[PDB]
Subunit: 224 residues, 2 copies
């Protein structure tokens, strides 16, 4: 996990130029059809750059190069924010965003918001690509089961929930430098897997119960 982080500059350096010219190109006199192409380089280039950025920092985390910072953040305000990106396209029918935050759960807890923001988004975004019609509910509750209260977050999948082989391969997902690029055909897109690894790093477990899927994450916490 040192490697990708060690040579991070040279994976960044040309990509910084691709968007560098692009966010610069918009200022030039662009014709009607030209600007349609240049912004495509902007729009598609970023979603690859963020992917690149998203795989390097997780590569840094498994090495122990950097730490997940512990701060006290508004748990509900983050979740309701996570919904608001998807609520704008929730007006299209045959899907319904539902949020249930059990009254017992705290409003603020100690953890890392940004990396939790990804995992909640990555679990939520997967539900949209899965469901053609239906409704998606996100529960934020704590399961008192266990020696010490632990927080749980789950998202319910609409269709073809999981391959029996496919899920097991998700639970035992550990990716190295080259492994993050190999395009394993088994199929959990990069987005899902990176998301999975973090939820192991912060403690707790990942759970998917496929019933004809509820991508569940159970972070820990100390009772205070």
């Amino acid at each position: 996990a040192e490697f990708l982080a060690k040579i991070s500059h040279e994976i960044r350096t040309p990509m910084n130029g691709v968007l560098g010219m692009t966010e610069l190109l918009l200022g030039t006199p662009l014709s009607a059809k030209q600007r349609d192409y240049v912004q495509t380089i902007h729009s598609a280039g970023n979603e690859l750059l963020t992917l690149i950025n998203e795989i390097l920092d997780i590569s840094k985390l498994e090495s122990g190069q950097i730490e997940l910072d512990e701060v006290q953040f508004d748990l509900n305000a983050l979740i309701e924010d996570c919904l608001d990106i998807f609520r704008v396209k929730a007006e299209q029918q045959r899907i319904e965003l539902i949020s249930f935050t059990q009254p017992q759960v705290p409003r603020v807890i100690g953890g890392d918001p940004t990396r939790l923001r990804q995992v909640v988004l990555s679990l939520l975004d997967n539900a949209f690509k899965q469901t053609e019609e239906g409704e998606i509910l996100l529960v934020v509750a704590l399961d008192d089961q266990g020696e010490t209260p632990r927080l749980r977050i789950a998202v319910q999948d609409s269709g073809h929930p999981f391959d029996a082989k496919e899920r097991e391969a998700l639970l035992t997902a550990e990716l190295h430098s080259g492994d993050f690029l190999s395009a394993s055909k088994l199929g959990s897109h990069l987005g899902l897997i990176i998301a999975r690894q973090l939820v192991r790093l912060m403690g707790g477990e990942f759970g998917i119960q496929s019933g004809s899927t509820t991508l569940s994450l159970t972070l820990p916490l100390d009772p205070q």
Copy 2:
């Protein structure tokens, strides 16, 4: 190239390069042209790098197996040189090739990788030499206990250092140390080229005369 870059890196970058090849068909100013010209000449660099990084990790891990089929040796070596002739005509370079009288027409092996290794060395020449002559000698080597094939590519080019020579022969990934970040970007395909030959069955070494650098592999020629 024998490693499939991810479904989520290849296709966004596929759209970026698709624009640059398409955008030049549109009238644009000179200063505007360089911006799109680099994205083609730089967006490829990252895509070439991600593949190269991935290729080593697959060679070391052993997930790569070689075909055993009969191919025409002359065509392959003749076909590789046809690629570079257009790149060699502009560059003031005369590339020449000699194939010994004794080396056979057909040998059993893997023609797809052997092309890549021959492509790998042959590219390195043009990368590090101008004004010079590039030569490709194909000749069997009888010094071993049994006749073996060996292919030599040398350039009237600038030599390799004492440490870059040592690095190309010893450095490995998911191992001790890769020794560089800046220096590998150009010479990474040569390590890959070594990985095949070392797997192919014979040793691949480099002897740098202080000017011409000869990169020669020895492949185990078929029994009879």
